[PDB]
From a paper:
In crystals of the monomeric C1877A mutant (space group P3121), this disordered, unstable region is further enlarged, as helix α+2 completely unfolds and α+3 unwinds to 3½ turns.
As a part of this study, we expressed CR-VI+, a 406-residue fragment comprising CR-VI and the adjoining ‘+ domain’, the variable region carrying the K-K-G-motif, investigated its MTase activity and solved its crystal structure. Besides sequentially methylating the 2′O and N7 atoms of small capped RNAs, CR-VI+ also 2′O methylates uncapped substrates and displays nucleotide triphosphatase (NTPase) activity. Both the CR-VI domain, which assumes a fairly standard MTase fold, and the K-K-G motif of the (mainly helical) +domain are required for the MTase reactions.
Numbering used by the authors:
A (entry chain B), B (entry chain B): 1616 to 1633, 1648 to 1910, 1937 to 2005
Write the structure that this text describes.
């Protein structure tokens, strides 16, 4: 139940601040996330590593987490800083997690989350709605020193709607205004448009590019404060930083592995067993989906041990026939689950 | 959506009214129930076959169904009599179905169920509680001409608690009393104690022994009316009637087979495909449970075609090694699902 002891199940995070390409089809950023089931985002972004000096400078007693889904990012934060309380908000709908199901799993209980948002309307859970930020202090009367946002907006221009609303709150809140300009919002951002100017009095301190970010996108985490408005990054800038990481850096695997989680993800993709190789250095009964799953994992089993980097991952994709049959027959949720189980196999090899 | 056309998915019911034994381990009474998923009871008992002449004599416009789980018995009744409305009650708890999920499936909608019991307490859903029978006319102001009970009471002596309560209602109900003694309760009964006398003024018209009843039990359906109280059956009497059926009679299979249901039950026991035999007259990747499932179904595939009766079923059990490994490794819900899929395979053979 000790928070600092649970961090051993979390992997070492590599990031970068602000002609060789890989061409892969699988979400390989999920290799070192085998120890997690409902949410996975806690493995790509970490507060102690990315904005650790900022957490020292302004010691927040309460952290405000918006658009947090299953709460894995919040969960790692609970392990990294075992004396910090949390305020949780995530969009209330059928399609996504609106309860910290992963936090509850790795931490044990919701005691440290003083306000989980239990008993709130669809409107008061949406970061793009004024009433959400109005009811943010409904329990915690602590200022929004550091506000974390990981919301995956359907129309990406909703990012701005919540940025303006964050600004509007910190500049019109009895609690927050007593801290001045030294208030930060660490939000996930996709570069839909190049060199876009931030709303009035919103400044980008730093742009963070994650190793655990999907290689094909333009996803980055930007530290926002109150100050003279500047331009946001662009697809190009992020893409070269993302690519530079993939070549040089290798994916770090969690020091300790949670067997209960490994087995959870296994049962989750398909109800069938994983095998250790006997090397010591018909399948007609399964459905088309169940076969493609086992056949990929068989290829991983038969494949030798290699460094956990996009060089070796590209090789595993190029050494497998029916790669396109695979990506078509398995949904985005299944392929992500697949890589968690694949990464475990690759870590447990030799 | 036509009720009479949906009866083709229901199997022909064989029953009996009131030294050779089989020794089987699997619930074979589930062979002809491949077309059903949430509930299965509709295949062992039918009103048009068992008490068809009684439904003619007193034409009920509304039928009262208590302890009905997923509502498959009610569903077959809807097909057998396409102009009858229903009142539904089943115990409200987490462990069992308290909504007619199977009726909704085979019929399409809950339009014919005038009172599904939606918005009732745990107490008003329990047949052993006075308030249940008090709120029975909360919608339907039609007398309890024929009341059907299939409740699977934890302590079997709760059967009497509801029988006395049924009596107490029909003899103290403004609506019901206007019909006199000619009121019937068709209830499931287990012979816990031999020759037990029914409560005062409750008479057993007939005792019904089903082919689709579990061979090892003492389950029977007894038609109860208001009259001089008589004795209930006993384990012995039922057992010889149950055995007499198993020897002579063969299980009738549904004329038409619902592919959507067959596939539902398949996915339900394990997420893997069923194969047609190519005769034209490693498995290390699966878990211990998934293997025992496939290995049994492989034995059924390799086995020749035979009559759907306990003679052939005993033979299939005696021709299979690890029969005890099977019954231990698979729960009562899984083995029941297994036989539904087994029966489909046996029906689809040659
Ligand atoms: N407009 C909006 N306002 C608030 N939350 C939103 C939103 N649009 C999407 N979301 C939330 O954003 C989430 C993206 S996933 C968040 C994962 C999280 N960082 C973790 O590690 O657990 C979704 O689950 C959804 O509930
Ligand atoms: N005391 C009680 N009062 C009412 N219902 C009860 C009960 N004890 C058990 N039950 C119900 O009895 C059901 C037995 S299964 C009923 C299946 C039904 N004939 C069909 O074909 O769909 C359980 O689902 C449970 O909800
Ligand atoms: Zn505030
Ligand atoms: Zn009445």
């Amino acid at each position: 139940i000790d928070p600092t002891e649970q961090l051993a199940y979390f992997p070492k995070i590599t990031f970068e601040r602000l002609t060789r390409n890989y061409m892969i089809l699988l979400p390989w950023q999920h290799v070192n996330r085998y120890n997690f089931v409902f949410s996975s985002t806690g493995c790509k972004v970490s507060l102690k590593t990315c904005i650790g000096k900022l957490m020292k400078d302004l010691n927040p007693k309460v952290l405000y987490f918006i658009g947090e889904g299953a709460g894995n990012w919040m969960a790692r934060t609970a392990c990294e800083y075992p004396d910090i309380k949390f305020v949780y908000r995530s969009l209330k709908d059928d399609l996504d997690h609106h309860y910290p199901l992963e936090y509850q799993r790795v931490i044990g209980e919701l005691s440290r989350i003083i306000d989980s948002g239990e008993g709130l309307s669809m409107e008061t859970t949406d970061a793009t709605q004024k009433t959400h930020w109005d009811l943010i202090h409904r329990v915690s009367k602590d200022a929004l020193l550091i506000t974390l946002c990981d919301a995956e907006f359907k129309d990406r221009d909703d990012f701005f709607k919540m940025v303006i609303l964050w600004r509007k709150h910190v500049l019109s809140c009895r609690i927050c205004t007593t801290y001045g300009t030294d208030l930060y919002l660490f939000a996930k951002y996709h570069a839909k448009d190049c060199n876009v100017k931030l709303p009035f009095f919103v400044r980008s301190v730093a742009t963070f590019i994650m190793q655990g970010s999907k290689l094909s996108g333009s996803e980055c985490y930007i530290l926002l404060t109150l100050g003279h408005h500047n331009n946001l990054p662009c697809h190009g800038e992020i893409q070269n930083s993302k690519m530079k990481i993939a070549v040089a850096n290798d994916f770090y695997a969690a020091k300790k592995l949670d067997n209960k989680s490994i087995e959870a993800n296994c049962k989750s993709l398909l109800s069938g067993l994983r095998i250790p190789i006997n090397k010591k250095e018909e399948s007609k009964w399964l459905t088309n989906k169940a076969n493609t799953i086992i056949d990929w994992l068989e290829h991983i089993l038969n494949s030798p041990k290699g460094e956990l980097n996009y060089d070796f991952f590209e090789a595993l994709e190029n050494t497998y026939p029916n790669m396109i049959k695979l990506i078509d027959n398995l949904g985005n949720a299944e392929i992500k689950k697949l890589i968690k189980v694949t990464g475990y196999m690759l870590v447990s090899k030799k």
